[PDB]
Ligand binder design. Structure first.
Ligand SMILES: [Mg+2]
Ligand SMILES: [Zn+2]
Lengths: 163, 190, 202, 52
RNA sequence: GGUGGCCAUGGAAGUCGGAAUCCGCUAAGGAGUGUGUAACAACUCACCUGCCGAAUCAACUAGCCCUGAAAAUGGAUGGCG
């Protein structure tokens, strides 16, 4: 990419959000996608197969360019997994009682959530992120018969196993 | 409430020699000599510093609104000192969409001659005050330089041409043309 | 906020002045909030960066403890943005050297510092003619095919002399990035000692 | 057409103004009070409208 | 920053609107005062720093004057003042 219009591989990053099935309403990326040798349709519908077999409730979506190859990975977002940690999937055409539904445990699955929080956090080790991603709630409301409310004060686990 | 005392010392540099005739301050440095009368304001101007180091303005049986003025005299004196040491320079950059404002100084300073502001046939003329040497700049395109010793005189004169150049019956949000002040500074900086 | 929360900070500074005898005085003049987040995690094995305000002139009140003395030599340096970085494992320079990351660089008109600045007679690579920042001063240049060269060399500005605005802007156009030393290190304290970054100190 | 720094000079002098809601008198950006005796020195100020 | 947070998608990733709604880095930064932006950004403001040196600020309430306050043969604190 540099004095004159060069490249030298294609290993260039682009990130997208949102996802029903895929797209397709005379639309996908454009702007970044078209000049880049990608398309709007084949590299759209191959974004189905990988962002599929269950994602249908908004996604984050890194697409890596290689010549004209668009790699369709679903990189997990902290609230997206906590929406998919739900008593899950009702999907579309009802839904209707809406997405403020809100009752889901994640007792050690938030441990597995704060585990898969890959790098991002620049972390004090669990016992603080456990509280960061525990505190970001609105749907669920903490562990079987509790509220996030009173986990924040304490967490008698994780701490010295994650370092 | 009357305040028994308020005062302020101006620190006078080694270059300059102020000498106050009662209340009337005269200032001579390198550049020239200035004068001004504080035959209104009513204060006590002492020159206490020997060799010659301090102007001190008193104020004395003064209520709030005259206590103000202690500091204002104190200012027009610094403002003189800066004028007679350094000297001031207001720059003013002409501005437009379209018709080139076409300036031409015409005795020495004095006549600042302006064709074509906004296609207008009437050639605006503007006098400077005495001691104000206008001049068209270089090292920049549409830009005047008003040099003088006296702030008072140099900035009416900016404002005279800044105000002579005003649009009428328009959006002056849109019609942003005319000549206006970009930079108040000095001739010599030190 | 702030008769209790104040009196709280006081107990955490007085702690690290006792427990932590190695003190690194750091200048963070240019900094980002995402920058420090990363510097604390890049040095998590080692150091403890401590950021306060004016109150840092409360070394007096730990020195008041009918106790410590040489904390008088810490007095002249609590001024003009400063924080300290308390560390157990120090061990001299060798962790101090690996801290120095990318940065100024910078270079501004009105500055003074480090050593004699040179621009090795190398071919620049800027757009053609672009000789006006050389022609303004005086260096022998030539268009060999397209791009520009200096076909000679010398020191542009020497130690103690001021750098002009045109000679500053030409140096940061060339990519030559000297005159700087902010967010890095100002003055170390280790056991009543007075180090000085002019150079033994490391 | 009219260079940005040049423009935002003139803007400084004709556009960023407060204005009295009583007397329509035009005031500097900082004004919390009018100048005019006529309105009764109001405080009812608003910013001058930025041209779209 | 965790962070296209949630609702809303028409865009609202801090921001036409609302439930809300809390941690990290902490220093300190509101899941945001605004500009504005389709949305951002970019900017700004809370918060917090750098530099300076001692008084500073806000809401009320009153005293005095200023405004509200506009009439017809010329013009009346009695006049002069
Ligand atoms: Mg009209
Ligand atoms: Zn008014």
């Amino acid at each position: 990419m540099p004095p004159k219009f060069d490249p030298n591989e294609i290993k260039v990053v682009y990130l997208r959000c949102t996802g029903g099935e895929v797209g397709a309403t005379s639309a996908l990326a454009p702007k970044i996608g078209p000049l880049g040798l990608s398309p709007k349709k084949v590299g759209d519908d191959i974004a189905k197969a990988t962002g599929d077999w269950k994602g249908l409730r908004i996604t984050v979506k890194l697409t890596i360019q290689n010549r004209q190859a668009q790699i369709e990975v679903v990189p997990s977002a902290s609230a997206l997994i906590i929406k998919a940690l739900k008593e899950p999937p009702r999907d579309r055409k009802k839904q209707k009682n809406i997405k403020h539904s809100g009752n889901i445990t994640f007792d050690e699955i938030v441990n597995i959530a704060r585990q898969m929080r890959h790098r991002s956090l620049a972390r004090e080790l669990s016992g603080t992120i456990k509280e960061i991603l525990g505190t970001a709630q609105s749907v669920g409301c903490n562990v079987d018969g509790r509220h996030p409310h009173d986990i924040i004060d304490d967490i008698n686990s994780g701490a010295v196993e994650c370092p | 409430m009357k305040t028994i005392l308020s005062n302020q010392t101006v620190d006078i540099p080694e270059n300059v020699d102020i000498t106050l005739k009662g209340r009337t301050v005269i200032v001579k440095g390198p550049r020239g000599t200035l004068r001004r009368d504080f035959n209104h304001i009513n204060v006590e101007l002492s020159l206490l510093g020997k060799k010659k180091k301090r102007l001190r303005v008193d104020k004395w049986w003064g209520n709030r609104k005259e206590l103000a003025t202690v500091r204002t005299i104190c200012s027009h004196v610094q403002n003189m000192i800066k004028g007679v040491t350094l000297g001031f320079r207001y720059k003013m950059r002409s501005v437009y969409a379209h018709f080139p404002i076409n300036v031409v100084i015409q005795e020495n300073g004095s006549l600042v001659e302006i064709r074509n502001f906004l296609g207008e046939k009437y050639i605006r003329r503007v006098r400077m005050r005495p001691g104000v040497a206008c001049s068209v700049s270089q090292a920049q395109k549409d830009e005047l330089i008003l040099e003088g010793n006296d702030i008072e005189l140099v900035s009416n004169s900016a404002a005279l041409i800044q105000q002579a150049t005003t649009v009428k019956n328009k959006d002056i949000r849109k019609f942003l043309d005319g000549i206006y002040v970009s930079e108040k500074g000095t001739v010599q900086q030190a | 906020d702030r008769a209790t929360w104040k009196s709280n900070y006081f107990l955490k500074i007085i702690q690290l002045l006792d427990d932590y005898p190695k003190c690194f005085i750091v200048g963070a003049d240019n900094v980002g909030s995402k920058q420090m987040q990363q510097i604390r995690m890049s040095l998590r094995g080692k150091a403890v960066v401590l950021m306060g305000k004016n109150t840092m002139m409360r070394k007096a009140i730990r020195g008041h403890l009918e106790n410590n003395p040489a904390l008088e030599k810490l007095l002249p340096h609590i001024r003009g943005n400063v924080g300290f970085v308390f560390t157990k494992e120090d061990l001299t320079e060798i962790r101090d050297m690996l801290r120095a990351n990318k940065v100024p660089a910078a270079a501004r008109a009105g500055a003074i510092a480090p050593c004699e600045v040179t621009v090795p007679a190398q071919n620049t690579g800027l757009g053609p003619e672009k000789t006006s920042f050389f022609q303004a001063l005086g260096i022998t240049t030539k268009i060999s095919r397209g791009t520009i060269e200096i076909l000679s060399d010398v020191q542009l500005i020497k130690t103690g002399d001021k750098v002009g605005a045109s000679e500053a802007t030409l140096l940061n156009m060339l990519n030559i990035s000297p005159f700087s030393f902010g967010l890095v290190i100002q003055q170390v304290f280790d056991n009543g000692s007075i180090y000085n970054p002019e150079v033994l100190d490391i | 057409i009219i260079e940005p720094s040049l423009r935002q000079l003139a803007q400084k002098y004709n556009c960023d103004k407060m204005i009295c809601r009583k007397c329509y008198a035009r005031l500097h950006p900082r004004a919390v009070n009018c100048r005019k005796k006529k309105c009764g020195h109001t405080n009812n100020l608003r910013p001058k409208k930025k041209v779209k």
